[PDB]
Amino acid sequence: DIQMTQSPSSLSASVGDRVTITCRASQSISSYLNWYQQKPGKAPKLLIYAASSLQSGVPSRFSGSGSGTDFTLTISSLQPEDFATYYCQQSYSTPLTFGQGTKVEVKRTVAAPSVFIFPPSDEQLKSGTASVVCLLNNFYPREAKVQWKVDNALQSGNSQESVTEQDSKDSTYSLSSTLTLSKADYEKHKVYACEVTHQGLSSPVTKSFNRGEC
């Protein structure tokens, strides 16, 4: 009955930056607005209640403001530990509802990925499937595009990818992408290419192999 809209959905900022996250309610909720912090692999943790009151234990760099429909959480000076996902939540009227969340990640200098490609193994090929893997290592920002090409044909729908959590030491990401095709399909074609587009690269980087090469 009351919708909470958070903005932005994702935020990049340097250590010591002022961070502001906004939460908007579909109707006036007085001051019954809560903020929670969630770190990866952990339970949400109460930061702020009644819009602006700090939970005991929470550092004074966290503050909240707003009444009625518009609310903001502020982190006055970002610290390494503050990188997490943040949720607003109204407790003004049932059903109680959460905002969609805001991920706060560390800003650093843009870094282009180092790109590596791996042919499928002979052991795997014996099972009737070919997995071709492309690695994008130690890059920033997170946003990156992998385009698989088989004999110049752009592949779509037959790949899956994942990204590591931001590195705590160097603030980079890495991405692994697997192209999956049948043994029969793999052996019918020759050139396997992983084309990488990223803000840090002036133009796309392609790593490729001819089936048979080692």
Binding site: Y32, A43, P44, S131, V133, N137
Partner: protein
């Protein structure tokens, strides 16, 4: 101190029933409302419902009304969340939380119960090499393919190699089985001499595998 402790991770099949629990300690359990919160993988938080354990007075969110039953056993200071017939879309992390009546905040949270619902069956991984070049920074690794359920553990050289290691989150394949890669960047000059072995363990299927990864020959 106030603590909420939730039951262990669940791996279930569609159509099966399930009841997970949440025990409160370090306070009067019958004095505070207890909420249940759903979090789908990589998604946001959703309020499901709330119970006052003193009298089992319950409110459900409209989306979960008739989908779940929330209950409590005050004699053992425990609140429950239950399904009679699980669906794969019930896959999520479930949190219980204490609700404080003054401002309506959820001030203390359980550690969470992970519920995985899938028609897939327990299966150990196959481990394939991601081979470095045989002809500078080189990458090599292991593809840990076709296992269920999560998780697997991966180390390199029995824990002696940690530098430059990236073990990626698993992806769920259309087959319903998971696939995971673990890589490491090394000097290309070490390739001839240094041994690289990935140690993979999948406890649910009792599948333990060591895979030596080296340059291939042509």
């Amino acid at each position: 101190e106030v603590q909420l402790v939730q039951s262990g991770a669940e791996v279930k099949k569609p159509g099966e029933s399930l009841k997970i629990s949440c025990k409160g300690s370090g306070y009067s359990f019958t004095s505070y409302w207890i909420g249940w919160v759903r979090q789908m993988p990589g998604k946001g938080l959703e309020w499901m419902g709330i119970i006052y354990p003193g009298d089992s007075d319950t409110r459900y969110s409209p989306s979960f009304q008739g989908q779940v039953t929330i209950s409590a056993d005050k004699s053992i200071s425990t609140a429950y969340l239950q399904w009679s017939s699980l669906k794969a879309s019930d896959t999520a992390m479930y949190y219980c939380a204490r609700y404080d009546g003054i401002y309506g905040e959820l001030d203390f949270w359980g550690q969470g119960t992970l519920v995985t619902v899938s028609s897939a069956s327990t299966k150990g991984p196959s481990v394939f090499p991601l081979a470095p070049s045989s002809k500078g920074t080189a990458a090599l690794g292991c593809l840990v393919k076709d296992y269920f359920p999560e998780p697997v553990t991966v180390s390199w050289n029995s824990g002696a190699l940690t530098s430059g290691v990236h073990t990626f989150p698993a992806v769920l394949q259309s087959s319903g089985l998971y696939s995971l890669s673990s890589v490491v960047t090394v000097p290309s000059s070490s390739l001839g001499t240094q041994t690289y072995i990935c140690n993979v363990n999948h406890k649910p299927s009792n599948t333990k595998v060591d895979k030596k990864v080296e340059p291939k020959s042509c």
